[PDB]
């Protein structure tokens, strides 16, 4: 099995430790953890393209999209590799992550290891919104916290 961790931080109170595990090189990836410091409600949660050693969430980039597809929710056939949907924060600002995904991988040509995990200010509209930007970013707005997805040490 391969394991990774992303430590989310930003310029504000949003932070958390996100774990990844992939038991087989072409098997599902499981993702879990908690994020604190969020406003109550849905927040977009994606793997972004950025893999340079830029300062925090200044150049997270577009979504990680090695197959040059349109934005969707995680269950949509047409989606970015990085499209992990939304997390939901409660009234005290904590969102629990619990995702099983078939599209991301920790291995091979399109590994997400080294890419940037991002949690957003607003909800992801899952590509179902009324503008072209829905089909790019889901209109999830600003990056509140980000971290490099690194192999577990
Ligand atoms: Cl925003
Ligand atoms: Cl803004
Ligand atoms: Cu994102
Ligand atoms: Zn996307």
From Swiss-Prot:
Q: What is the lineage of its organism?
A: Eukaryota, Metazoa, Chordata, Craniata, Vertebrata
Q: Which GO terms describe its biological process?
A: action potential initiation; anterograde axonal transport; apoptotic process; auditory receptor cell stereocilium organization; cellular response to ATP; cellular response to cadmium ion; cellular response to potassium ion; determination of adult lifespan
Share what the entry says about its subunit structure, partners included: Homodimer; non-disulfide-linked. Homodimerization may take place via the ditryptophan cross-link at Trp-32. Heterodimer with SOD1. The heterodimer CCS:SOD1 interacts with SLC31A1; this heterotrimer is Cu(1+)-mediated and its maintenance is regulated through SOD1 activation. Interacts with DAOA; the interaction is direct.
Q: What is the effect of changing residue 122 to A?
A: Decreased succinylation
Q: Which residues carry this modification: N-acetylalanine?
A: 1
In the record's cofactor note, how is the cofactor described as bound? Binds 1 copper ion per subunit.
Q: Mutating residue 80 to R leads to what result?
A: In ALS1; sporadic form; interferes with zinc binding
Q: List-wise, which residues carry N6-acetyllysine?
A: 122, 136
On whether Ubl conjugation is a keyword of this UniProt record, the answer is yes
* SUPFAM superfamilies registered for this protein in UniProt: Cu,Zn superoxide dismutase-like
Consequence of changing residue 97 to M: In ALS1; increases tendency to form fibrillar aggregates
Q: What is this protein called?
A: Superoxide dismutase [Cu-Zn]
Q: Which Gene Ontology molecular function entries are recorded, alphabetically?
A: copper ion binding; identical protein binding; protein homodimerization activity; protein phosphatase 2B binding; protein-folding chaperone binding; small GTPase binding; superoxide dismutase activity; zinc ion binding
Q: What else is known?
A: The protein (both wild-type and ALS1 variants) has a tendency to form fibrillar aggregates in the absence of the intramolecular disulfide bond or of bound zinc ions. These aggregates may have cytotoxic effects. Zinc binding promotes dimerization and stabilizes the native form.
**Main localization (coarse):** cytoplasm
Could you confirm whether the keyword DNA-binding appears in this record?
Answer: no
Upon changing residue 85 to R, the result is:
In ALS1; ubiquitinated by RNF19A; interferes with zinc-binding; ubiquitinated by MARCHF5; leading to the degradation of mitochondrial SOD1
Organism of derivation? Homo sapiens (Human)
Database matches in CDD domains: Cu-Zn_Superoxide_Dismutase
Provide the effect of residue 146 to S. Answer: Enhances formation of fibrillar aggregates in the absence of bound zinc
Tell me the compartments it is located in. Answer: Cytoplasm; Nucleus
């Amino acid at each position: 099995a391969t394991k990774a961790v992303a430590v989310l931080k930003g310029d504000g109170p949003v932070q958390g430790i996100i774990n990844f595990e992939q038991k087989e090189s072409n098997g599902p990836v499981k993702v879990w953890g908690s994020i604190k410091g969020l406003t109550e409600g849905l927040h977009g949660f994606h793997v972004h393209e950025e893999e340079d050693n830029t300062a925090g969430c200044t150049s997270a980039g577009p979504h990680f999209n090695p197959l040059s597809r349109k934005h969707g929710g995680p269950k949509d056939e047409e989606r970015h590799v990085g499209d992990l949907g939304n997390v939901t924060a409660d009234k005290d600002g904590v969102a629990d992550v619990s995702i099983e995904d078939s599209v991301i991988s920790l291995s091979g040509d399109h590994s997400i290891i080294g890419r940037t995990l991002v949690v957003h200010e607003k909800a992801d509209d899952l590509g179902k919104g009324g503008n072209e930007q829905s089909t790019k970013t889901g209109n999830a707005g600003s990056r509140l916290a980000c971290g490099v997805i690194g192999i577990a040490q």
